[PDB]
Structure 1
Amino acid sequence: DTNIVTLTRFVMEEGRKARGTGEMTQLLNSLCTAVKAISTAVRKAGIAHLYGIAGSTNVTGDQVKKLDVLSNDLVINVLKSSFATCVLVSEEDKNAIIVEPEKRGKYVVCFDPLDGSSNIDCLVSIGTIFGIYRKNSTDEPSEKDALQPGRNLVAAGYALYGSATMLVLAMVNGVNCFMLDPAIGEFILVDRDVKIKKKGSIYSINEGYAKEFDPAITEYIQRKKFPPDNSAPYGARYVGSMVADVHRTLVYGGIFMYPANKKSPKGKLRLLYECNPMAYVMEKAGGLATTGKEAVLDIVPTDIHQRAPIILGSPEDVTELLEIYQKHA
């Protein structure tokens, strides 16, 4: 253990030749601290009486859990103090947060402080999702600086509070996974340069919405259950927490779906702090992320709380679904 390959070091080493100010290291170190604090709280939530609701509703009309409040405060406070940020967008706040002049840095951060709210009380895996942009304007920071297409991301990733706590970080040249060592409070590199398989054998979707699915999603699911070539049908997995289903898709291959449907023209998941970060991870891992008609990373948002359909995973799987959408167009 006398040579610890920490997230901090990894991020510093890799970007030593590319010169720079080092605020990204500052930013990520800061986020790592929030993530450890959130992990620790989650791991003892029932004894700390942190299960249950807060007594409020966010703009996308969700019921605010107590862990939502704690996680949101922790992430906002550490990013503010990092001296690396100017504009913050969170699922739990109606408007973009503008950092005080004294603490401003060059980055814009979009995040979901706690993802998988419906799974909190039953102890299923939950997580934290983030996407980081460089501010491009030269005028005063504002919500508009958050309204960039996902392809403009410079880093993105998530923390998974699962059987272990994992920080998955994607940047311009690839994806790397760091596991939290709970004894020393450090994220250790455990998977380098992760790449998704070209084709998997698991599909992930909430089939409770079958009555509302479009014909293409309907056809695809039927094909996973009854393959026309006598191959083995795909297995099904749906934890119910985007971070957990997407993490599995990344390391085992396959496809994850939260499509548009008859009641939800743009799906459920939020483009800025759920769909773009996972789409970015997936594309840097050799995967694809589509709405069924266009690349998620190419959408130009007009609303920080905008929703988007998302279909992601192994490229041959996502492509097969796109072919079906194309055929039905």
Structure 2
Amino acid sequence: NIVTLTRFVMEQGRKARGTGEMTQLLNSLCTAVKAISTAVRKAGIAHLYGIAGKLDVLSNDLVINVLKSSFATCVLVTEEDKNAIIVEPEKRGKYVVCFDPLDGSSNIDCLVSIGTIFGIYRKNSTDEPSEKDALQPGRNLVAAGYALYGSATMLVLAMVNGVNCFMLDPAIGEFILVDRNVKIKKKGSIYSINEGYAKEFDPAITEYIQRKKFPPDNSAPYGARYVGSMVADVHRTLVYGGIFMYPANKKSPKGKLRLLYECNPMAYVMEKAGGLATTGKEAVLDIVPTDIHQRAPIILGSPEDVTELLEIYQKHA
């Protein structure tokens, strides 16, 4: 009585009486992620080193061809491509897929955890697909999730029904459901932010950080953690509780994280897990995108920690 991703996706496609198109899509994603995982852990590297006489780019190509080979997509948006990819009408399905094929690429030389992030929208409208089809607020997401290539490979999938975590068994190449209907803690004890940007923080963030290090009610201070790869930082937030933040600063008054393929999927996982995701002023899932590579400030995590900071944001409002 074990549950594999392949079994789960099919039973769910059956319960929802789908035509099987989304199921074929989710299966192609599962296959793409296993292929990326393998290249990340460097299997075959000996060949590059002459035993017999890129990564971001390879990841992009894998995700694109595998997704197109699903016959379930019409518009693809990648962090790696300036323009949205419109699918050939022969393989054109009804899904729009926004993804970051390998987030944290600059961490690669340091062997820090990296991941793949994706959000799926159903093409709403009836005209020649285009970038406009991806410009939907995150509230319209059919599914969203990410794959984390850390000490082990994990796929976290969020859909209307909830959040589920699947661990990859690289021996048989199968994702096994290990955490079902996940819920984030109401209050965590870790905060995550790049404090090297201190001089740039708005007063509300500055005050919050101060409350965490020197608690006014004399409670224990929060521990700090900042891996430097969103997928790793968010996954730790989801599993262990706490708050993650990447607010605005000189690096764009608009934030650094991209709305469509970084913030939205994460905000979606967070909300389905019972947490919050806000820009400080509004909920991330409610922002109407105007540009496929639009950035946005984001704060996510345990609801009590996010509301606490939202209050400070009010006090300074």
Asked whether the two chains share a fold, i.e. TM above 0.5, the reply is yes
- Give how far 1:47 is off: 2.9
* 1:265 and 2:263 correspond: no
Identical residues among aligned pairs (%): 99
Is contact 2:193–2:226 with CA below 8 Å preserved after alignment? yes
| Residue 269 of structure 2: aligned partner | 281
User: Cα deviations across residues 35-79 of structure 1 (Å, max 9, x unaligned)?
Assistant: 111110110179368899999xxxxxxxxxxx1100000000000
* Cα 1:132–1:243 shift into 2, 3 Å: same
Structure 1 stretch displaced more, 260-269 or 43-52:
43-52
Distance 2:250 2:276 in 1: 24
CA deviation vs aligned residue, 1:204-249 (integer Å, no higher than 9, x gap):
0000100111000000000000000110000000000000000000
User: Are 2:10 and 1:12 equivalent residues in the alignment?
Assistant: yes
Q: Label 1:276 to 1:48 Cα distance change in 2 as closer, same or farther (>3 A).
A: farther
Q: CA deviation at 1:16?
A: 1.8
Q: Note closer, same or farther for the CA distance 1:209–1:159 as it changes in structure 2 (3 Å cut).
A: same
What is the rounded CA distance, in whole Å, between the counterparts of 2:50 and 2:77 in structure 1? 24
1:158, 1:168 within 8 Å by CA — same for their partners in 2? yes
TM-score, normalised by the number of residues in structure 2: 0.96
Deviation at 1:4, TM superposition (A): 3.9
Structure 2 CA distance for partners of 1:308 and 1:45, relative to 1, 3 Å: farther
Query: Does the 8 Å contact 1:91/1:305 carry over to 2?
Result: yes
Indicate if the aligned counterparts of 1:275 and 1:308 stay in contact, CA closer than 8 A: yes
- Conservation of the 8 A alpha-carbon contact between 1:258 and 1:268: yes
Structure 2 CA distance for aligned equivalents of residues 308 and 183 of structure 1 = 39
C-alpha distance in 1, partners of 2:234/2:80?
22
Is the Cα contact below 8 Å between 2:25 and 2:72 reproduced in 1?
A: yes
Unaligned runs of 5+ in 2: none
Structure 2 CA distance, aligned partners of 1:50 and 1:226?
A: 51
| 1:121–1:51 Cα change, 3 Å | farther
Partners of 1:16 and 1:280 in 2: CA distance: 23
Offset at 1:34? 1.0
Distance 2:155 2:163 in 1: 11
Q: CA RMSD in A?
A: 2.8
What is the rounded CA distance, in whole Å, between the counterparts of 1:281 and 1:238 in structure 2? 20
Q: Which moved more, 1:201-210 or 1:262-271?
A: 262-271
1:48 alignment partner, SS class: helix
1:80 aligned to which of 44, 49, 68: 68
C-alpha distance 88-53 of structure 1, shift in aligned 2 (>3 A): farther
- In the TM superposition, residue 117 of structure 1 has moved relative to its aligned partner by 1.6
- Deviation larger for 117-126 or 258-267: 258-267
Of residues 41-50 and 281-290 in structure 1, the stretch that sits farther from structure 2 once superposed is 41-50
> What are the ranges of 5 or more consecutive residues in structure 1 without an aligned counterpart?
56-66
> Could you tell me which of 219, 223, 233 is aligned with 2:211?
223
1:134-162 Cα deviation digits (max 9, x unpaired): 00010111000000000000100000000
Query: Normalised by the size of structure 1, how large is the TM-score?
Result: 0.93
Equivalent pairs counted in the alignment come to: 316
| Cα distance, 1:258–1:46 mapped onto 2, change above 3 Å | farther
- 1:120 and 1:45 map into 2 onto residues whose CA distance is 15
Is contact 1:178-1:190 (8 Å) kept? yes
- Report if the CA contact (8 A) 1:266-1:308 is conserved: yes
Q: Is the 8 A contact 1:54 1:69 kept in 2?
A: no
Could you say if the C-alpha distance between residues 143 and 202 of structure 1 is closer, same or farther in structure 2, counting changes exceeding 3 Å? same
